Design an enzyme around this catalytic site. Sequence first.
Site, short mmCIF file in Angstrom:
data_model
loop_
_atom_site.label_atom_id
_atom_site.label_comp_id
_atom_site.label_asym_id
_atom_site.label_seq_id
_atom_site.Cartn_x
_atom_site.Cartn_y
_atom_site.Cartn_z
N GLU A 4 -9.44 -0.39 13.76
CA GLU A 4 -10.95 -0.32 13.90
C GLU A 4 -11.37 -0.99 15.23
OE1 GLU A 4 -13.09 1.58 11.90
OE2 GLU A 4 -11.06 2.05 11.14
N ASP A 36 4.07 -10.15 14.19
CA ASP A 36 4.21 -10.35 12.76
C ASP A 36 5.47 -11.26 12.55
OD1 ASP A 36 3.62 -10.09 10.06
OD2 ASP A 36 3.81 -7.91 9.86
N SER A 93 15.29 28.73 24.99
CA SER A 93 15.95 27.98 26.07
C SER A 93 15.37 26.56 26.19
CB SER A 93 15.83 28.71 27.40
OG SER A 93 16.53 27.99 28.41
N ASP A 114 -1.20 0.26 39.33
CA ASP A 114 -1.92 1.28 38.56
C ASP A 114 -1.00 2.47 38.20
OD1 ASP A 114 -4.33 -0.23 38.49
OD2 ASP A 114 -5.42 1.24 39.79
N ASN A 149 0.88 -1.21 0.00
CA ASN A 149 0.00 0.00 0.00
C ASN A 149 0.90 1.24 0.00
OD1 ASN A 149 -0.29 1.77 2.62
ND2 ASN A 149 -0.27 -0.31 3.48
N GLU A 172 -4.06 -5.87 7.82
CA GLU A 172 -2.87 -5.14 8.16
C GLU A 172 -2.20 -4.58 6.90
OE1 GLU A 172 0.49 -5.67 7.38
OE2 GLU A 172 1.51 -4.46 8.89
O1 LIG Z 1 0.33 0.40 6.14
C1 LIG Z 1 1.26 0.31 6.98
O2 LIG Z 1 1.45 1.11 7.93
C2 LIG Z 1 2.28 -0.83 6.87
C3 LIG Z 1 1.70 -2.02 6.10
C4 LIG Z 1 2.83 -3.05 5.73
N1 LIG Z 1 3.69 -3.43 6.85
C5 LIG Z 1 4.78 -4.20 6.68
O3 LIG Z 1 4.90 -4.82 5.63
N2 LIG Z 1 5.67 -4.24 7.71
C6 LIG Z 1 6.85 -5.14 7.84
C7 LIG Z 1 8.13 -4.59 7.22
C8 LIG Z 1 8.57 -3.28 7.88
C9 LIG Z 1 9.74 -2.71 7.02
C10 LIG Z 1 11.09 -3.42 7.42
O4 LIG Z 1 11.04 -4.33 8.22
N3 LIG Z 1 12.30 -3.06 6.85
C11 LIG Z 1 13.48 -3.83 7.25
C12 LIG Z 1 14.51 -2.96 7.91
N4 LIG Z 1 14.22 -2.70 9.35
C13 LIG Z 1 14.14 -1.41 9.76
O5 LIG Z 1 14.24 -0.46 9.00
C14 LIG Z 1 14.00 -1.11 11.11
C15 LIG Z 1 13.16 -0.03 11.42
C16 LIG Z 1 13.00 0.38 12.75
C17 LIG Z 1 13.71 -0.29 13.75
F1 LIG Z 1 13.51 0.14 15.01
N5 LIG Z 1 14.54 -1.32 13.47
C18 LIG Z 1 14.73 -1.75 12.12
C19 LIG Z 1 12.34 -2.14 5.85
C20 LIG Z 1 12.77 -0.83 6.04
C21 LIG Z 1 12.78 0.09 4.98
C22 LIG Z 1 12.35 -0.30 3.72
C23 LIG Z 1 11.92 -1.61 3.51
C24 LIG Z 1 11.91 -2.52 4.58
C25 LIG Z 1 7.19 -5.45 9.31
O6 LIG Z 1 6.98 -4.56 10.18
O7 LIG Z 1 7.74 -6.57 9.52
C26 LIG Z 1 3.81 -2.38 4.70
O8 LIG Z 1 4.80 -1.80 5.19
O9 LIG Z 1 3.54 -2.42 3.48
CA LIG Z 2 -12.49 3.98 11.76
CL LIG Z 3 6.67 -8.00 14.81
ZN LIG Z 4 3.12 -8.27 8.01
ZN LIG Z 5 3.67 -6.97 5.05
#
Ligand SMILES: O=C(O)CC[C@H](NC(=O)N[C@@H](CCCC(=O)N(CCNC(=O)c1ccc(F)nc1)c1ccccc1)C(=O)O)C(=O)O
Ligand SMILES: [Ca+2]
Ligand SMILES: [Cl-]
Ligand SMILES: [Zn+2]
Ligand SMILES: [Zn+2]
Lengths: 694, 694
Positions: free
Chosen positions: A379, A399, A574, A610, A203, A370
């Site tokens: 939601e 995930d 500041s 709490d 997306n 997701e």
């Molecule tokens: O709509 C949305 O918000 C997200 C829906 C979907 N989510 C998704 O696919 N998430 C995966 C991938 C997240 C991206 C990722 O893991 N990396 C791998 C590298 N890891 C990191 O950049 C990273 C980021 C933050 C952190 F604290 N540690 C490592 C990445 C980074 C940049 C470009 C392409 C991929 C996940 O969380 O496992 C998408 O991104 O298309």
């Molecule tokens: Ca909504």
């Molecule tokens: Cl995760």
């Molecule tokens: Zn995923």
């Molecule tokens: Zn994904």
Amino acid sequence: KHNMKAFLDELKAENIKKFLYNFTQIPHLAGTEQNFQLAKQIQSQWKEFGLDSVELAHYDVLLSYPNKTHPNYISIINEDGNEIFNTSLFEPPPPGYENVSDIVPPFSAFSPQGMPEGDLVYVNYARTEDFFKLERDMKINCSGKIVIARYGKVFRGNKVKNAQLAGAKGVILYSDPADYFAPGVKSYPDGWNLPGGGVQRGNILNLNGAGDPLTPGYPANEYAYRRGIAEAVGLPSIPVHPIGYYDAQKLLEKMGGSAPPDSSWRGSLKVPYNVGPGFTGNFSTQKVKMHIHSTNEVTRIYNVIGTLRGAVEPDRYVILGGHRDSWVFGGIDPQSGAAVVHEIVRSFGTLKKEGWRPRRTILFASWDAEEFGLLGSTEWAEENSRLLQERGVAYINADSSIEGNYTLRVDCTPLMYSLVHNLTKELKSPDEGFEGKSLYESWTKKSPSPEFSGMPRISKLGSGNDFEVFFQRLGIASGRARYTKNWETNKFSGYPLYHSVYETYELVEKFYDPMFKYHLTVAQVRGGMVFELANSIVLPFDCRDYAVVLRKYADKIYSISMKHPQEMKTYSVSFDSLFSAVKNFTEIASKFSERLQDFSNPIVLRMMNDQLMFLERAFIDPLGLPDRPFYRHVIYAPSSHNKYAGESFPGIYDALFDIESKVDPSKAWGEVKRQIYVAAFTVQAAAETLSEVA
Amino acid sequence: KHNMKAFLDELKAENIKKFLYNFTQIPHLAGTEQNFQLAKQIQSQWKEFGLDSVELAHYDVLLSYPNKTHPNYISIINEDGNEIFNTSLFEPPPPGYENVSDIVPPFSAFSPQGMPEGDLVYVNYARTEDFFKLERDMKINCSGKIVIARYGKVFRGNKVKNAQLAGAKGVILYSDPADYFAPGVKSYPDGWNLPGGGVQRGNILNLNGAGDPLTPGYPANEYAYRRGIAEAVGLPSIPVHPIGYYDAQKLLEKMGGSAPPDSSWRGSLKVPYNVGPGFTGNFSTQKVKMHIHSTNEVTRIYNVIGTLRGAVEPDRYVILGGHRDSWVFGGIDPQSGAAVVHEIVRSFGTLKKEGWRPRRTILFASWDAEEFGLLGSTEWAEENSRLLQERGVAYINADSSIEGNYTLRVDCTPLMYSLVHNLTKELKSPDEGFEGKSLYESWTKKSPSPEFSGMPRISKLGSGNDFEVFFQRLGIASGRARYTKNWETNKFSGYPLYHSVYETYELVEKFYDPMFKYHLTVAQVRGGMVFELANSIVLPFDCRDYAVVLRKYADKIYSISMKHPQEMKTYSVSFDSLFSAVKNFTEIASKFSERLQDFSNPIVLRMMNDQLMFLERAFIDPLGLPDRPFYRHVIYAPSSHNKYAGESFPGIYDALFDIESKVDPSKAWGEVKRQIYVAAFTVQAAAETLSEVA
Ligand SMILES: O=C(O)CC[C@H](NC(=O)N[C@@H](CCCC(=O)N(CCNC(=O)c1ccc(F)nc1)c1ccccc1)C(=O)O)C(=O)O
Ligand SMILES: [Ca+2]
Ligand SMILES: [Cl-]
Ligand SMILES: [Zn+2]
Ligand SMILES: [Zn+2]
Ligand SMILES: *[C@@H]1O[C@H](CO)[C@@H](O[C@@H]2O[C@H](CO)[C@@H](O[C@@H]3O[C@H](CO)[C@@H](O)[C@H](O[C@H]4O[C@H](CO)[C@@H](O)[C@H](O)[C@@H]4O)[C@@H]3O)[C@H](O)[C@H]2NC(C)=O)[C@H](O)[C@H]1NC(C)=O
Ligand SMILES: *[C@@H]1O[C@H](CO)[C@@H](O[C@@H]2O[C@H](CO)[C@@H](O[C@@H]3O[C@H](CO)[C@@H](O)[C@H](O[C@H]4O[C@H](CO)[C@@H](O)[C@H](O)[C@@H]4O)[C@@H]3O)[C@H](O)[C@H]2NC(C)=O)[C@H](O)[C@H]1NC(C)=O
Ligand SMILES: O=C(O)CC[C@H](NC(=O)N[C@@H](CCCC(=O)N(CCNC(=O)c1ccc(F)nc1)c1ccccc1)C(=O)O)C(=O)O
Ligand SMILES: *[C@@H]1O[C@H](CO)[C@@H](O[C@@H]2O[C@H](CO)[C@@H](O)[C@H](O)[C@H]2NC(C)=O)[C@H](O)[C@H]1NC(C)=O
Ligand SMILES: *[C@@H]1O[C@H](CO)[C@@H](O[C@@H]2O[C@H](CO)[C@@H](O)[C@H](O)[C@H]2NC(C)=O)[C@H](O)[C@H]1NC(C)=O
Ligand SMILES: *[C@@H]1O[C@H](CO)[C@@H](O[C@@H]2O[C@H](CO)[C@@H](O)[C@H](O)[C@H]2NC(C)=O)[C@H](O)[C@H]1NC(C)=O
Ligand SMILES: *[C@@H]1O[C@H](CO)[C@@H](O[C@@H]2O[C@H](CO)[C@@H](O)[C@H](O)[C@H]2NC(C)=O)[C@H](O)[C@H]1NC(C)=O
Ligand SMILES: *[C@@H]1O[C@H](CO)[C@@H](O)[C@H](O)[C@H]1NC(C)=O
Ligand SMILES: *[C@@H]1O[C@H](CO)[C@@H](O)[C@H](O)[C@H]1NC(C)=O
Ligand SMILES: *[C@@H]1O[C@H](CO)[C@@H](O)[C@H](O)[C@H]1NC(C)=O
Ligand SMILES: *[C@@H]1O[C@H](CO)[C@@H](O)[C@H](O)[C@H]1NC(C)=O
Ligand SMILES: *[C@@H]1O[C@H](CO)[C@@H](O)[C@H](O)[C@H]1NC(C)=O
Ligand SMILES: *[C@@H]1O[C@H](CO)[C@@H](O)[C@H](O)[C@H]1NC(C)=O
Ligand SMILES: *[C@@H]1O[C@H](CO)[C@@H](O)[C@H](O)[C@H]1NC(C)=O
Ligand SMILES: *[C@@H]1O[C@H](CO)[C@@H](O)[C@H](O)[C@H]1NC(C)=O
Ligand SMILES: [Ca+2]
Ligand SMILES: [Cl-]
Ligand SMILES: [Zn+2]
Ligand SMILES: [Zn+2]
């Protein structure tokens, strides 16, 4: 005995393997009949496993799908209008799957329809700084052009927003082997590398936490009022499509104009990587044309919600959640995670049938949609906001369990640093060369902390996954964990077969984790964290760890400001009040810990649990950050330049970003000071929740 | 024994009298040295009385004051520019006070400066419907005119907003004897009536809950960032001044133009009450001119906060609050209330010195700057929002104890209806003819419920006093009580000497309550409510009472909509989802009460007290109502036409108001439906907080 070790010993590698195989034979795209069928399977098995109740919660949300009889593709067209080159209509399916139906072809979800025609400009990764280099230093104007950008470094949604604001009329995204193709390893099916015909789905929304584009703030239930499309949140305004590197080589090989400004703009293909605009002289009258016919439509989605009632504090909730929808087979993303959740439910259910119950309630979730913008989690949380904010202890995400096989990765709130350190010291390392050693020792050795000798790296939470609504909107302590690759050598663009047809069960079993021992280690970490959070008499949060990172974050934002010493003098800027708040938090948190170590009294116990539960909640500002009302946490937000990255003191960071370019310095430095005020006040108000109550 | 009857018996009429005398000898205007001195006295005596801690909390807020060497006044000017008539510079001071200094002269707080000149239009009470009658039916245009309006019926702030939007260039407010002068009773000092030289002070802001105009959302502390004046919340844009009926007779006696449209536009003075514009022929070239030189300035204010720690639930807060600042002597408003608070602190302190403590913490407050926009209460709540929302049980207000001597007045949340009925049945009536009877019996007889035989009238909370931030912003259950006048015969414009120099100790002792028995009855009601809320083992809230009024409010808003049957058909406008939510709330609340009657278990007890505490909180919407972000309660808001009145389902009411005049019916009925969705969802989400928790 019924203790954590019984829980951990009942998990098995062999069960996780079986479940991963069961979840990855056919596609499970959000909104399709096969993902509804998998939801009904999961609900039925979670009841058999022992949970007290298991329900589907459904919502009718905006999704996006290609037109089956009117395919998306890109062309080079000549002077006369003949399409002399056409991008592929599908990825070559892998061995054994060449007869599976319902594989969605590559597309950018939520692209508007169109057929724009024009000259190409190459924009590197389409980051904020890449557009600054193009427009400010090279004097190249993207207005009315089609931009082509390589995937990598930042969320694809931010690339599209950046291209739109530079005036582009379409976007083309592709995977370059320099980012997604590794040293001496073969392409699928012989290795874990990306083939020239492979393409990354995904997306391209900019939702900033809203959820369903049509119903911001409220659940998309049966009687919901919906915005019209023109008022919907986060939709892009120009057509977008993704391609593989064989197709990309054809589109780049003819590019003219300026040379790349330096070697960080060159990928791996055998082309100059010229920036444009347009092609070199022989082919100067040829053009690129997009054809996009995808449609947006309101479609039903289904979350599975399982409940295991607490024996003592049934009104306190510990949540384990991860998604079930996939772009195609979901071999890593998400079923490597959902299979681990399945085994964790099974083990808690084993204990429950022998008569055990946890102290606090545990809620288990299989989220839908997701991949289309965190829509199922968001939601459900909008619907249940009042319960989650007065009763929610913690949220653990689930995930992908693996994106590598080198060491552990943890990102979480500072409140869980001590819990993670203690649990990983009690777990066995699965790494070769650390036979008989703790997970703490191997992780610490392979991934050292930048700050402190003898500790491992733990990162800030960013976004792009289902914890976003629980942490940055509602202020519930959150964490995540998985196996990852080596930090040096890591290009930070993801695993090569991410969101591709090649991401299969066989990918995992043959090249990532043949014994399922990394899956098992990750199940012990995620399930061990949930066990301690739900069973420990005193919540396992250490407030002093928040006090240490807040000083680090204040030093960091102060140093950004000190690059502008003349303006700090002129406008009387500041940071004294922020450092004062952070000092007060450090002192009050220290006194709170002393009281927590001294006290047979359950009321003092509920009172103090709490104070620990509501401390994360205290960092929430009900007015939200500027123009991003669903990002309410004042310490942590997703970067405005990269949804995947976390930013600290985001109000102040964004008021300072590129401030030297603003036209009215006086107004820009007024807003810096306002953001300093908000952050000092919020840190001091958080500290005061830990003072004696009366 | 230490029970409620010990508490109640220790209160004395004679103590309340002494304290009222002590609080009313000199003026205590917000921001002056004498109101700081009274704050230090109150703090010192609350510690002597026994409270565990007593502190001042200060804030630097925008106030407004006249210019001492450059007085405000109004003129009639002739053709040549001679001022042939001048309004008074001060009220004739009463007997014995003719040498007291520091009496602020009459003014409208927060008026901008100016000296506008022009023709008069008479606008009755300056209500929304009075401007509709002028512009729609009579065709009279107020653009560029000075409007003169009588006080009464609605908050003076709403009158000024209405005049501004009709294009007026100034406003003149006056007290008409038809509203503020009663049958056969003499003017002060011989009776309780208003003299022709008396004038009503008061602020003319439209804050809609913001607090300090310069710091919306955040406390006005030492390091606060302030908006510039042009971006401040709620300031009027045209000059305004108040006058007495001798001065008003001079300005009205010469009015020409149209006749009053009916007898509801005529007051009591010997003038035609012609609407204008301008004067009759002989004096047609004369004009009215205003001279206003008041200044706005940031001034320090001081709240007194006393604490009596709870023995069992020290982290649960019951608040008794009322203001201490006055326009001049404050004989009724507010010291008749603050003297009652003083005696209530003294009695709780008596019990505490004999070794008693309440179950829950009780907080006592002396607010500052209430008269300038609820500024002291609102800034303190902004500072302490996180503690009040997770720990606040209830708030009981304590402004004026008397505005009459006929019977009791209670306005509160439905959650306290049953508590009020039970407490007043255990109290003695002070009314002549009810010697030996209960307060319940006399109140019920003199002020019958409209709906139910054998019950007394209890009204909805409106606004214009210090409960506004606790109830409509934070969602803490709130109530208020005082003695009032007869409901028939009541013109609803206040007591005649309201906000005047004539409002003195002698006013109260001679004409309202010579024996201080009504003060004593009101102290038993306010203090009895605080005692039960802070000491009862189960919180004394009945959720079923919310279920009954919600059905009444849904019937009422449905009947407003049904005046437009063709549009409800065209746009498919259904109230089905709201009635469904209200039905579900009725059923779930009924089941909750059954469980509350069955259960030795403190956790089930804390759990169920927490469901009762968070039920009011559940009606809060964090996005607020349209354009009024600090009014967050979805069931109750202050009327958009009259801050003093409460409105039910205010989102829906305002979307329906005057809908037949809107230019795009389709868009206007879309918004009705959106507001129906928000209200149904919120009622259903509130109901679900009372379901079993897991
Ligand atoms: O709509 C949305 O918000 C997200 C829906 C979907 N989510 C998704 O696919 N998430 C995966 C991938 C997240 C991206 C990722 O893991 N990396 C791998 C590298 N890891 C990191 O950049 C990273 C980021 C933050 C952190 F604290 N540690 C490592 C990445 C980074 C940049 C470009 C392409 C991929 C996940 O969380 O496992 C998408 O991104 O298309
Ligand atoms: Ca909504
Ligand atoms: Cl995760
Ligand atoms: Zn995923
Ligand atoms: Zn994904
Ligand atoms: C961190 O915690 C400490 C508490 O240990 C807290 O200290 C507070 O700092 C403020 C300063 O901003 C103090 O405010 C003062 O209060 C006194 C009365 O008690 C006033 O008279 C002072 O006002 C005069 O001086 C000002 C400064 O020059 C003038 O501008 C003003 O016009 C007056 O002339 C002043 O307001 C406060 O008393 C202490 N509280 C203590 C020591 O208990 C600190 O604020 C906390 N940090 C944050 C960010 O909250
Ligand atoms: C008050 O409480 C009751 C609970 O007792 C609650 O009842 C719920 O009402 C909704 C109707 O809005 C029900 O939703 C249905 O759920 C089933 C699956 O369980 C779906 O298959 C249904 O969808 C089909 O039919 C629709 C209607 O014609 C079609 O538009 C749709 O496209 C599908 O073809 C439908 O969504 C829900 O199941 C009940 N829950 C019960 C009985 O448990 C009611 O909503 C509450 N009121 C409020 C305002 O919340
Ligand atoms: O800034 C602000 O918000 C208010 C500051 C100040 N507050 C104030 O003076 N409040 C008084 C008076 C409130 C007005 C009042 O009591 N009446 C008396 C009539 N009572 C009612 O209208 C009434 C309203 C609601 C209800 F549920 N029951 C009775 C009134 C009404 C209209 C015009 C003039 C006076 C109080 O609450 O005791 C002011 O109004 O200037
Ligand atoms: C995945 O596992 C499930 C559960 O074992 C299989 O579903 C069962 O299939 C059998 C045989 O058709 C039926 O008797 C049961 O009714 C099913 N149970 C359910 C839905 O809970 C499913 O067939 C497996 N899928 C694959 C692809 O192997
Ligand atoms: C992680 O483990 C450490 C070491 O066992 C825990 O810290 C100890 O906690 C006990 C029990 O309160 C104290 O008496 C010790 O003094 C602590 N040792 C220290 C601070 O060095 C720590 O609490 C654990 N963290 C959790 C449970 O979140
Ligand atoms: C109102 O009552 C207070 C408290 O009794 C009086 O203040 C005291 O005055 C005496 C004599 O000047 C002093 O010894 C005390 O120090 C004061 N106590 C305080 C401030 O707590 C005050 O004078 C009375 N006011 C009026 C107008 O009668
Ligand atoms: C007000 O008084 C009534 C009558 O005493 C209370 O209702 C009774 O409460 C007891 C104790 O739970 C029950 O056993 C009775 O059945 C109730 N009688 C009824 C409902 O008619 C009521 O709870 C009191 N209201 C409060 C304390 O808020
Ligand atoms: C898919 O494309 C065809 C044109 O070939 C069109 O008629 C049909 O309506 C499209 N489907 C949509 C827009 O859902
Ligand atoms: C590309 O597709 C279009 C439409 O189907 C067709 O007219 C054209 O011949 C194709 N071009 C090539 C080179 O295959
Ligand atoms: C880029 O090109 C378009 C004209 O086709 C123009 O609107 C825009 O201002 C240009 N920007 C420049 C030259 O900086
Ligand atoms: C798995 O581990 C081996 C051992 O170092 C490594 O060389 C291989 O590349 C790893 N697989 C993946 C997918 O990283
Ligand atoms: C009060 O009025 C005089 C003019 O007679 C003016 O000079 C003075 O500055 C005014 N005070 C203010 C605005 O505070
Ligand atoms: C009203 O006051 C002004 C200014 O002090 C003065 O010039 C005028 O004479 C006064 N008019 C009357 C009738 O007293
Ligand atoms: C009222 O008068 C002014 C002109 O002086 C004008 O701007 C406004 O539109 C008028 N409104 C009418 C006549 O309705
Ligand atoms: C006090 O009570 C008497 C008895 O009816 C009544 O006539 C009188 O007007 C009352 N005083 C006031 C201020 O209402
Ligand atoms: Ca404020
Ligand atoms: Cl009151
Ligand atoms: Zn008052
Ligand atoms: Zn008042």
